[PDB]
Homo-oligomer: A and B are copies of this chain.
Amino acid sequence: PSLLLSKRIIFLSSPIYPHISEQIISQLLYLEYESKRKPIHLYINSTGDIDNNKIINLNGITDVISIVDVINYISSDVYTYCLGKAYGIACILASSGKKGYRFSLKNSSFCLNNKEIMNTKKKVIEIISKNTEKDTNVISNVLERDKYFNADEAVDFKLIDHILEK
């Protein structure tokens, strides 16, 4: 029953390792069953599925997809706050928060990075599209190149809604 949980806070402070998806989902389910429409605050500082240029989760995509799915299943709105970084699947995750409720701090940085590969790669494009309110085509183009955003850049691209200053 940890502390932050009591405040309806979930803080992802690490790369998303295999066991992380399990934890985040358990916490969402728990919070949802505790109070039905109370908001949940998901704080994110993460490099996604890579750490020091090494892939630390081979399931990263499918894992993040599970999270967003649950995020969409529950009645409680999830707000997101990017503290340091949201890269790769962390960025996908950050942008899946309730529209209008996706936040970042001033200095935050963002990045976007056999019918299994196919079905999966399609679902992620589809998620980013709905999130950023763009066509599937323009997104699949953006993904061809590694693209980094700063807070303001991210707000224009519609990954984020507001910047929290002072």
Number of residues on chain A facing chain B (CB within 8 A): 45
Given contacts A9-B33, A73-B165, A164-B73, contact A66 B26 (CB under 8 A): no
Given contacts A123-B107, A165-B73, contact A4 B30 (CB under 8 A): yes
A139 at interface (Cβ–Cβ under 8 A)? Answer: no
Q: Are B84 and A66 in contact (CB under 8 A)?
A: yes
Q: How far is the CA of A33 from the CA of B83 in the complex (A)?
A: 16
Q: Are A45 and B30 in contact (CB under 8 A)?
A: no
A54 at interface (Cβ–Cβ under 8 A)? Answer: no
Q: Are B43 and A29 in contact (CB under 8 A)?
A: yes
Counting chain B CB atoms within 10 Å of each CB, the highest count among A21, A22, A119 belongs to: A22
Partner of A14, one of B22, B41, B70: B22
**In the complex, chain A residues 133-166 whose Cβ is within 8 Å of any chain B Cβ:** 148, 150, 164-166
In the complex, how many angstroms separate the beta carbon of A16 from the nearest chain B beta carbon?
14
Hey, which chain B residues are within 8 Å of A9, CB to CB?
29-30, 33
